[model samples]
Target: DEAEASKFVEEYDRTSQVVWNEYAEANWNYNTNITTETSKILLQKNMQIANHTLKYGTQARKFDVNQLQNTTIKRIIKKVQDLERAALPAQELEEYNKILLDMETTYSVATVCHPNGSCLQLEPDLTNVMATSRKYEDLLWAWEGWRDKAGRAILQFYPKYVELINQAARLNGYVDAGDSWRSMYETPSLEQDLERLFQELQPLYLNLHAYVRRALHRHYGAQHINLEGPIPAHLLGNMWAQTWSNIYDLVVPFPSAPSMDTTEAMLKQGWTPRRMFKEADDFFTSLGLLPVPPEFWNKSMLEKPTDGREVVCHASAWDFYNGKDFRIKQCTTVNLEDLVVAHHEMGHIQYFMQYKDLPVALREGANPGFHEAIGDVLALSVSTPKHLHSLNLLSSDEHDINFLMKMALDKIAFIPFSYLVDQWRWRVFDGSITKENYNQEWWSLRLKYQGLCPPVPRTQGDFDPGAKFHIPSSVPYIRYFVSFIIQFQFHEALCQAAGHTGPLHKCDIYQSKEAGQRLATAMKLGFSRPWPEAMQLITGQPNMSASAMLSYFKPLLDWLRTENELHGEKLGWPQYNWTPA
Candidate 1:
């Protein structure tokens, strides 16, 4: 509170530990007291904790500002991200819950950096750190922006959703099956997954779609929507393979990677899985998004020589990565898989790069979904057959069809289940269910709502892959579903930009740049513009639609039928066409 304190605080050793420990201590205790019946109050109480946490964070940031370069700050952040990262697993339910913890801690820590908080007084300006250094804190702006618009739109504030399905269908010359029509998720049959995917995605998709469209009603939306493409070549260099990887190298979810020296000796040529996710467990800690991912994370890493390792990755690029050399078994597979990782990482980098220059008000991500969607959209390059062909992963339409179908359907399939899980958490906190009751409820609701009855005995309760991280954290469940719909809308927009048609699952990105220019253009337009206006300007569409998503159900239907026939039971997988709730 002292004026001299501000100046003296310049050199003060205010590591985030002070605030981190304070918030952690109290929140952890209050967390145990939270009950589903009192969830409303708990929600409010949680936010209060956030208010207090931010207070600690703001002061700490000021006290810590001059210490940004200290190796310890990075270490602390990594430790946290690593914890969260450790929770992600192959199980759907677990993954869903894991996000909750990640969200809670991340948001809790984030409160410390809000515009009105103590952090602002620290450096007074983030950009002063140096060009390209990661921005300290700024997710609130985007998150708030997205939430404000989402609160009121029709279809419950997800306009971009309606437009995407409609447009995708129009491109392929079809229409959606309508809201009641849901695709069958959880089906091993690839087709059924797609059918259920969009149906599941519909409710949430419409919510986000409406909000983005509403946002465009203002002039700010137009500015970003109508901006020119390509993001200027200089920006490309900043996004290239080397730069992207280098930045991620700085943020580890696990903070477990070996020294740049040891890693240098271990990784082979090109983009290795270890290199790509090198920071999977590292980066989110600073913002408190993840807590240590698994130790075996890097164990699955590979050297895909055919991909970027030999192409965009200059031989010396390995040396740039702390002296590591990567090897590829083939000469042709330069598909953008490796390049995709770098680009997504760049999305995070760009946010830091851009926000560092803005006043904290415009710097935040309001809803993480928006930011996550952007990175995901960029990484979607992997889902395209053309991208695959470039990497030599596929060579013909036959191969492309199978591959693209697999990729698209898998995500689509995941949609309904994802939606179900989010709703489950909402219900849990609302006293509609309990953790012990989660499994049985999960299985039934999924079967009833998504037509995704699995062949194996299953209970969907609190056993989420990320259950420990997210559900308790409290706020992210809504956003995950919210952003998922937005992500599809983004994908739909990019598909339109590149001239792909029909349901997203049916549309192939084989010939398109994955709309790289247009997509990146959308990414760079920044919050300087509103979401809806940006959609119209870039994709020539307003919000999203259900028609196109409806059209993609053919494959899904067949997939369901096949699986049902194989199981020899009508109940093995439910169909939504005529069943009454």
Candidate 2:
């Protein structure tokens, strides 16, 4: 075990890319017409996913009820929860942090990871799965390559993109990442904020997801809709370039002229669904990672017989065949968004890699930010100014301006968004809106808060009913939004440490030793301690600091004012002023 610990210390930080869709890719013709039965089949297959997740406990709070009281870990949870319930403000938030000391103290007494541990391993049969494909490496490669492309596809792809980048940021312990934000606000007060904030930002979060689905269905999913053919290649780029509150991400990298030839080549590649699969495969081989199995890839059925529960006749590529050569293509190109199937899924891959050696009890974060930040930290490079020179994503300086506009919208802050989404669920769970009326209520809430107007039925079920995300299955990943705020704070600390803060295009925290140190420190805590204590080690700050987001959104307001755009047009906010409250 000590040797195992020694071995992984150096290997844990090796950032990797993975793709997860090869399973489905090789199974079907991929070129053939996907039938409604296919939809129905997938729907049925995934229909029970939320329950499974609920059972898995993304829903499971690591310990038993007894541990929640006596363990050192319990002190962190109990203290934070007590403070949150008491509604601690900035000052008291500071005072409350003293408990992080106890939380840290309790780690030795609390973190039970050996065989007789308190937090039992739930499901070890499945290693780190990447959506359907398990090709986590290729997905990361694909994400690295998507800095280019255009239009609606790019815009719709951002939430997921942000999801991954935030993951990376958190995992690497990148300062300006979602994990920092999550670690900052680990308490009961924040839980209530989850309810209240949801009531506020539900409109924005829901409407955006709605529009993305609309864009996916209308532009990418349709049989012959005449738009970008059903699998929009450019959605990832656009999502990065547009949207509000997830900005400290991809779009910020847009302010310069990309290398002319590189930009042209990126634009010229005809993105076909077939080619996407091939490209995805090539990406994995390039990374020196495992590819999906040929059998799983070329399977006729989605499952096997006798065990009709097997979603295929045969599966392929990589050797996840359960001891036989039954390879299920468990590590490549199976592509399903409901499972976070894109390149972003690799964030989870890298996460498992970082903590593979950790005891089971410390597998996940004490708080959500610990994980969310790792996923999003990749955005630092992918979303920064240096990209203009090195990347082929942006063409003109004007494109950068457009990107800046989009970035401005995104950086505004996520507290409002997370808080509002929390309330939406609270309302749903409390019997305030029937499932039927819930859609209408959700729709109206979107219009009221985030100012999104969509063309589809805005029902709660349609919020991608099959989603295994924290919210529907159990408690929402409410920490992510707040984590976004605190992530920026971590970035600020990183910036100060590295001397890297300034105008949108000039910031330089990405390539610093301090940044790397900050990340490793965070990861250590991830492997060893709860999130809030780990956060204390790095940030030395409060959970609900509004500075990062306030600073983040300040630019958006500036841009809106400079561009003479009025929020009243779609948002109904006072004419134009968006000054900090």
Candidate 3:
């Protein structure tokens, strides 16, 4: 038995790359061909087997089999065990699978049919309206329309979905789903450590929040935003209020700030999909990161298909069969948002290239947050005022107030929302918020951390949290929260390595080979050691903090503090209660 198990472990280690290439490729293929039943069946079956094999081994029953020794095998065992719990009855298991299917499919295909007899995807449709429209009734109509249509489908499954995971986790030696999920960080005390990180970052985020609230109240008037009350969700420019940067145009502090209309630049240059991909490649090569292979140009899906068939428009970067094949799937257009997104996606591609020498098992980020943060760090640098001006992409206005205010809205605003996503999920899993109070409790926390309340009243029957894709998808949300913090830390450290840094906000390390070399070294470490070991390669720090973020936004933070104090606006969260309306 021992001999057979060791042999299997070696084989498992060896074939992991090839096997996962099949799995990952299948997923990308399925996403593009979502409307096809054949593709649907193929994806579901492939996932079923992949899930079974990873959790159970070639055959997995005994947890204690390798926990006594052989830490690698033990890690594999725990990794698999932590993911697919084994408790729900056969009927509910099928329901859980179907719910995932419905959410993915519905999100792709669902559109808001307007009174004009035209339609658009619920997400983009909502975004277009919130960003462009000023009337309260017009914004409210679009918001409610998307939720009642798309949001209702997701909410249909939340209760059983939450219960199913909770049941499975408890039976399999975890206190609840949160305990099992949090335990994945390869560290001894992830829950406690992350809570400590959350606590340390509070004062910084509160300052950012207070500032944004004051700005919104000024822009939209008291009827739209209350100085002492929660900011309404629709007013923030995102349907979900996830990122507030879209509202920066209306709320920018400086009246005569220089602005670069990136959309016009794309039009003048006649930028195509391939040209955009080339731009991403140049950024990597300039950083001394590896250039994407030629096949990346030839093999990737750079735009949406022209035929009648529908494809998902959301962009993603994929590493096919490790370093041998790399690609990005996006409906690219010549715009600033897509330009920055290309840099972000290429961050993922280079990270794969950097780590390709490691064993398949070791070829991931030190943590999920590390992986997500990589591209965003590059994007942030590219977005800075000085960096844009250097490339002739920005106008020559030294507008610190406008630039920093936008940065505060975009980057700094995300930290707390990201943390709260998993915080609420964990509370649900651990049974602190009982099923009866799920909806009410969800808003209570949103009000507290985000200072956001629903545009209209909400009640227990609403099932509001399910309106977010991550809730139904069951992916952990903490990584997003952490990534928002560390992207700045990583950028600040790299800027220091490049020399001549006056304020952290203005620092950009473009064309700096020294910074790229440092990042590549850290990237190459993969997950072979704990996250701290990799972090030390760049920042010399083990734990994450908001110090870099606070420094970068210090100009804006200072401005906001004076503004809030002058207006008699409170700078922190206050006591609140909720009821069904």
Candidate 4:
């Protein structure tokens, strides 16, 4: 029986690798070039892969791992059995894949037509407006236009998508899709832990939020922003109001402080997309990690193709599942932000390389959040003023209060939003929040957690949540929330390993092989161990916490509180209940 189990795992690995190779290629091609034919091909591939895994996973469930003595085989089989949304009947699986593909395609190609008949895609056009335009009306237009075109377009398909996924989750023995997602972490206390961690960081987020609100109030005046109430979502310099760092000029704490903006310096140095990636790759190698393979360079779409094709511009890294083949697809711009994003995306490629030799089932992060955090952990160092100065991108290594404020605006501001996205969806999956109240409940949660309000009035007809890519694509979002906390924990540990002293925010582990060795040890474990074990290897901690993250931003928190108190600013927003007219 033990011999058979071992053979079963071997066969499972071989078969899974084959299907995964095909699926990954198809997915990569479709994402790089979006067309009706490609969309259909992707859907066909998705269904095929889903069916293969579901069949094997169902068979794997019959094996009692407790009777098996070999821990390795048992571990692989358990992972195989713990399929997410793959336990559906053939017909239902096809429907599920179709709905997912449709939503993805709609989001990818949907465009907002202006009053003058000019249309704008969400990528360069609308996102640029969201990032650079400070006009209240223009930001509102881009925000509303995106939702009306993309979100409203997907409303009809969303409930059905939810139903099918929930059905698959039920067939897989989960109460719902959300429960299936939670189980991936192997923690029974995930919800409670999230609540606790979020509460732990609330004081910091509130201080940051209040300070930004006052800054926006000064910029936009009382006619636009209610200083004591929730900030208008559109005014935050992002479409979703998730990250506010783009408005650094508006809310910068110390105006006289040396500006940390690196876009100008990058352009002056004539940095290209290729250069940005090379710099990131070199940083990893300096850490003694493997360099990305030549195939990565040849195959990856590093910039938006100039050949006039519709490709998803959202940044992502890919593994071909064939080992030795990894790539990143991003419409990269030569700017400070994209440079850090380059490092983040490359961090994923490093993980793929580190774990490539593991069995197919184990070729992933210990948890989804671990995978998300890896790239960002690298980014934490790359974005620091000291690291940028080493690259000659910044003139000074001096710590600026504005730099920390900018980082807090992006990093600290994202936690609540990341938590609430999945929170909303989890409730949606469990039938606690019904279809009729979808938009109403979305705003309610946004106001409650983020202190952000809709720039315009919304109705039941608006499916605003669908506007976010994760919603339509059926990706769980709480991983991002978890990543925000753990990445800091990771940064702190790696910094200590690099033999750095003094402020946590100023530490850089760019070329420290000691730090790199520690990171590689954990990354190479992949999902072979529980996340806590991997976390412990890197951070000497078994549980995720907000302490390191809080420690990293302690200075910003102190500055914000002092500033707010001096200005007589309110620390929290007035709570409002959302009731339909």
Candidate 5:
């Protein structure tokens, strides 16, 4: 029985790897080209893979894992039986794949058209407008245009997508799709754990929020902004109000402080997209990790194709599962933001390289959040003034508070938004927020968590949530929220391994082979063990906590509280009523 179980798992792995490789190739082609032909090929490949998985899952259900003596074989058998979304009939599987393909393609090709008939793609055009435009009406226009183009374009498809996913969850013995997503953590209390972490960091978010709100009110005036209520979303300098870092000019505590903007420096130094990626590659190799393969440079879509092709430029890393091909698809630009993003995406490539020797089933993060956290952990160290100074990107590390405030604006402000994206989706999946009240419930949660309101009145006809890429792409968002907390924990642990005795914010593990070895040890574990064990291996703590994040940002948190109190600013906003027309 043990031999039979091992053979069964091995055969399944062999067959699945071929199917996965083919599907990944198709996916890469479609994302890079965005042509109708590529889309159809991707859909056919997706259906083929889905059918193959369903057949194996049904066959695997006949096996009794209790009869297997080998623990690894038993685990593999169990995994084969618990097929997520793939445990569906051929017809439903096709429909599910089609809807997913349609929504993602819509987002990929979406463009906001101005009254002058000029259209802007989300990558560099609309995102640029949101980041740089200070005029109230201009931001509002882009905000409204995006929702209309991308959000409402897929409104009719969402309900059926939800229904199909819920059915797949039921087939897998889950209560709903949301429940299945939480099950990925292998913990019964993931929802409660998230809530606890949120509460732990809420005070810091509130302080930052209050300070940014006060600054916005002063810049936009009371007529356009409210001091006691949620700030207008467009005024926060992001389409979704997820990050407020772009509005730093209005909120900078000291104008005379050394500037942190590295865009000018990068341009002056003749930085290009390839150079940025090479720099990130060097950073990883410095710590004794493997360099990116030669094929990575050959195959990656490093920048927007100038030959006039529509592509999905959302900055993601792909592991082809064949063990040799790994690539990132990004519409790169020459700036500090993209430089940091380059490192983050490459972090995924490094993980793929590290864990390629494991069985395909175990070739993933111990939990989904672990994968997302890895890149951000690198970014945390790479972005520090100490690290930037080492690279000659910054002239001084004297203006630490200014740098911390900028970090707070981007990182701390994002915690609640990250928590709430999945919070809204979980409710939707479980049927708590009905289709008729979708927009209303979305804003309600945003107000409750992010303390922000829409620039224009939203109605039931508006599918605002769909405007975000993850919503249409069907990616779970709680991973990002969890990543935000654990990245700090990982950073602190890596710093300690490097023998750093400075402030947590200033510690950089750039060339520390010790730190790299500790990280590599955890990465190689992949998903073979529960996430807590992996967490323990690296951080010396078995559970995820916000203490490390709080410690890292303690100075900024203290400064925000003192400044808010001195200026008589409110720590949080009043709850608002959302009436859908």
Candidate 6:
């Protein structure tokens, strides 16, 4: 049984690396039909291996659990059990594959434009309009057009998506897909940890939400938004209210003060596509990790099209060889958003670089959240005014009331929004949220968690939630929420170790060898040890919590509370005892 388990696990690992490399190649330049089709084919082949491995685990489970003394063999068998408890029926599986491919192709090919046939890319174009364009008609037009186009494509497939998700989860011996997804952590009481994070974040989030809504009401008037009700979704300066920092210009804390243009400062510092990435790469080396190999630079797809090819602009980090061959694929530009994103992407590369020597299965994140959180943790530090100023990219006067306000808008506002994405999906995956009530249930959660509402009335037919790519792509999204919460916790710990004596939010541990060595120690463990072990390496504890987040934001929360109280605004939607049936 031990030999059989080892052989099976090794074969799966080997095949997985090959298929992932193929998928990465296709993702690098998914402009051609051949690469797109090749990706789809690889996905099918990957799923086939998953099915066969599930059966192999079923055989392994019959052995005495105590008898499997080999750690690797034991882990492989348990992983198989967690990953696959049953296989989907052939027809259901086929429908899943078809929907997956179709939605993916639609997203890649669909391009929004400005009537002059000038395509609007999300990063600096359409996103720029939503954030900065004060003209209501243009914002509303871009807002509805993109949502409607994307929603129409995938919402029709909602029923099938729901069915496939439920079927897949049930087969995996889970109560539902949500349960299965949450259980992926391999930790005890995963549900309780998730709930704790949401609860802990509420106080800070509620104050931030109230302040944003109040500001919008003052700007747009009663006809555009009610002071006592949820804020309009489209008016929030994000395609979704995922990132509200873009709209920071309109709701400036110091109306007479100038906005900080990090982009202008970046240009002054001779920032280019190559330098943007090099700075990100320098971050890991500062932390005592191996410098990312040269192949990463040569083989990456960093710049956008002057080549007339219609490639997707979805930025991602890839470790195709799962070793020194790490690369990032983004439409790099000279802006703060892209700068922070490059740092985030390098976070992934550094983690892979740290753990490449581990067994293939163990080379993953401590858990998916740890993987996502690492980049953002470094970014949280990098984006601080003090750090940027140190890099000669910000004036000494840049860190001010407006600077903190914008940071609060982006980071504090994002907490609950991140939670809501997966929260809505979880209900849908379970039987609680169904086709007939999809949009209604979606808004209910949005209202409940985020205090957000549609600009206009929505119904089942609208499918506005499908406007976001994650829904149609069938990507599990809770990792982002987890990332948002834990990065602060991780950031706080890193600062503490670096012997910082100031406020947590203002603390910058860049170029601290002690901090870098500590982070590398944690990353080196990877998923070889359970997530708790990896987390404890840096944080000095085994549990994930939001105490650090609350502490870091206390000053901002204090200001928000005072602002909301002075203006007579509600903090969040009224909370009642929600007794589950």
> Least lDDT summed over 10 consecutive residues: which range in candidate 6?
572-581
Model 6 over residues 66-95: C-alpha lDDT tens digits? 578787567655665654323666677767
lDDT of each: 0.35, 0.36, 0.72, 0.86, 0.87, 0.74
User: Model 1: residues >4 Å from true position, as ranges?
Assistant: 1-271, 274-346, 394-397, 450-469, 472-475, 495-530, 547-581
Best of the two (3, 4) by lDDT: 4
What value of lDDT does candidate 6 attain over all alpha carbons? 0.74
lDDT string, candidate 5, 1-581, tens digits: 66767788888889988998999999999999988799889988877887778888887888898887776677677888887768877789889988998999898889998679999988889888888898888998899999999999888889999999999999998899998898888898888999999999988998888888888878877677667778788877778888887887888876788565677788888899999999999989888888999999999999999989888889999999989999999999888788888998998999998889888888889888899988788888888877887777788333777878888887888899999999999999999988898888898898999888887887657999999999999999999998899999999999999999967988888998988898899999887788899999999989999999999988888878888999898778763542111
Q: What is the lDDT of residue 483 in candidate 1?
A: 47
Per-residue lDDT for 1-581 in model 2, tens only? 33333233223212110011222332232212233454344333232322332232221233342434334343322222211202223333333232322222221111113345433111110111111121323322232222111111222322332333334333333332333333444464655555553444333333333333233344333442212111121233221112332222323334353323322344475433233343433433333333334542454232222331212111222221122122222222222111122222333333444444443334445465555654344353345546434433344445545545444444432344444454565455434654455445654554355433332222223432112123222335465665565566666665666676664334545446665566556664543554566666656763445555445445434544433323212323322222111
Q: How high is the lDDT of residue 420 in model 1?
A: 60
Of the two candidates 2 and 6, the one with more favorable TM-score, higher being better, is: 6
Instruction: Candidate 6: give the clashing pairs.
Output: none
Root-mean-square deviation of every model: 22.9, 17.9, 3.2, 2.0, 1.9, 4.0
Q: Which portions of model 5 show Cα errors greater than 4 Å?
A: 396-398, 575-581
Candidate 1 differs from the real structure by a C-alpha RMSD in angstroms, to one decimal, of 22.9
Prediction 2 global C-alpha lDDT: 0.36
Alpha carbon lDDT of residue 118, candidate 4? 98
TM-score of each: 0.40, 0.47, 0.90, 0.97, 0.97, 0.90
Reference-based TM-score, model 1: 0.40
